[PDB]
């Protein structure tokens, strides 16, 4: 499972970094290029793929 | 360094077909991609294509 992801907003490969703040149960995914940021709740079973998942889902939901 | 022919002999075969050695085939590969890369770096080539 890759940790760096293509940004849904600027389509820059591996430009998204994921930070797991487990102490606060929050994952923050940020694109280095276009500076888009997204915050989602996470669990101890969560992974950066799950945070990027929640980001893609939030984008598609907001774009309806 | 290309080695000489004795390090990579071209052994002749029951007929006339001269089979080359693995090193010779590999030097063929290196040469073709070296020439091809040379013409790309000499010309305009995408940095990722040159890479």
């Amino acid at each position: 499972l890759e940790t760096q992801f293509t940004c849904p907003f600027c389509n820059h490969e591996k430009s998204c970094d994921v930070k797991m703040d487990r102490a606060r149960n929050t994952g923050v995914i940020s694109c280095t290029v276009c500076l888009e940021e997204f915050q989602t709740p996470i669990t101890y079973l969560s992974e950066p793929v799950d945070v990027y998942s929640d980001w893609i889902d939030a984008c598609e939901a907001a774009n309806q | 360094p290309v080695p000489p022919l004795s390090v990579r002999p071209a052994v002749v075969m029951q007929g006339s077909a001269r089979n080359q050695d693995d090193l010779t085939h590999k030097l063929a590969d290196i040469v073709k991609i070296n020439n091809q890369l040379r013409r790309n770096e000499q010309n305009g080539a995408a940095a990722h294509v040159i890479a």
Binding site: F9, H12, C34, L35, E36, A62 | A46
Partner: protein, 365 residues
């Protein structure tokens, strides 16, 4: 100021004096707008703005969500408080909407009936403003970081496009020829800008820390390469003669086109003699930028002293171009400011930032 009016009436001073002095005074009194608002439609940060060059009424805005909004800046209502309403919108439901962020939008000069928009979806689309349909599309092998049409060309209608490829593309809007390219850069071309003075002069700034001026008619590469030191650290041209100590992610010719303002990721802005690329050594202090893409900043027009409005973190830093003296920080944005566009008719400013807001700065009183 009553002195200014009296001198204008009595002919002591040319009306030019009052006009430019009052323009400068208005720019100095720039503040968060008391009675003005801009309609919010972008779901993401605004990466670019462009007020049309003729009549200065309509404004384009490209968002990080790929939509393009067309606003009317005129206060067609009778109140002193108004919102810049959105006339048109390439929204998510448009058949030709950009799939990724729109990074540059530009009105066609000489006519408001057409505009262009380049996106990280590797497309430069040319839109008919009336029907609001794509008149043309140019596809690129790599994402577009910036594009620019010449604000002066009555003869050519080339769009200079800077992508992550090391080549500057020149797309002819006359019969569609995107094959023309300029060689000489080595990394992504983060900014491109045509000279407002010379028809065929194009300045290109790339991540290789170099800024090159090209005569696109010419067959012999760039005209000038900008050098910080002008020759103090002189070396055979393979890696020396850098404009900045980082990525040069913004270009802006001054109003007259005799100088060039380059902003780079070394936290420095520099002013260059546009005729021989000599550094004028104007200081400007430290200009904070860390943008990984092109940075859009503009200069003032029709004032006694030229100003440059640079995005500076979540603020707009206003500098005097030829002295470098820091005028002020326009401080009203909540995230990093991506673009600022200057309305020269009324010395107004419109800034788009990552907080999904377009803020209008108007002179006070």
């Amino acid at each position: 100021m009553l002195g200014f009016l009296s001198a204008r009436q009595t002919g002591l001073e040319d009306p030019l004096r009052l006009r430019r002095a009052e323009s400068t005074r208005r720019v100095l009194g720039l503040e968060l707008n008391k009675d003005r608002d801009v309609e919010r439609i972008h779901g993401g940060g605004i990466n670019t703005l462009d007020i049309e060059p003729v009549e200065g009424r309509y404004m384009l805005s490209g968002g990080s969500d790929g939509v393009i909004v067309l606003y009317d800046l005129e206060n067609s209502s009778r109140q002193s408080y108004y919102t810049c309403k959105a006339v048109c919108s390439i929204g998510r439901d448009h058949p030709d909407v950009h799939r990724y962020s729109v990074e540059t939008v530009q009105w066609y000069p000489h006519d408001t009936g057409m505009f262009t928009s380049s996106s990280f979806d590797k497309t430069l689309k040319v839109w008919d403003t009336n029907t609001l349909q794509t008149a043309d599309v140019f596809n690129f092998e790599e994402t577009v970081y910036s594009h620019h049409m010449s604000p002066v060309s009555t003869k050519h209608c080339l769009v200079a496009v800077g992508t992550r490829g090391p080549k500057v593309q020149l797309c002819d809007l006359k019969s569609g020829s995107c094959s023309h390219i300029l060689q000489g850069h080595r990394q992504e071309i983060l900014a491109v800008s045509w000279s407002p003075r010379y028809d065929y002069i194009l300045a290109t700034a790339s991540a290789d820390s170099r800024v090159k001026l090209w005569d696109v008619r010419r067959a012999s590469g760039c005209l000038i390469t900008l050098d910080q030191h002008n020759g103090k650290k002189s070396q055979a041209v393979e890696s020396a003669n850098t404009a900045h100590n980082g990525k040069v992610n913004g270009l802006c010719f001054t109003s007259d086109g005799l100088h060039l303002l380059t902003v780079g990721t070394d936290n420095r802005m520099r002013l260059w003699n546009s005729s021989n690329g000599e550094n004028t050594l104007v200081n400007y202090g430290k200009v904070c930028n860390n943008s990984k893409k092109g940075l859009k900043f503009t200069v003032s027009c029709g004032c006694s002293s030229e100003f440059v409005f640079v995005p500076y973190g979540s603020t707009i830093a206003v500098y005097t171009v030829y002295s470098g003296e820091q005028i002020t920080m326009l401080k009203g944005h909540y995230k990093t400011v991506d673009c600022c566009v200057f309305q020269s008719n009324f010395q107004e400013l419109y800034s788009g930032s990552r907080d999904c807001n377009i803020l209008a700065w108007v002179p006070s009183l």
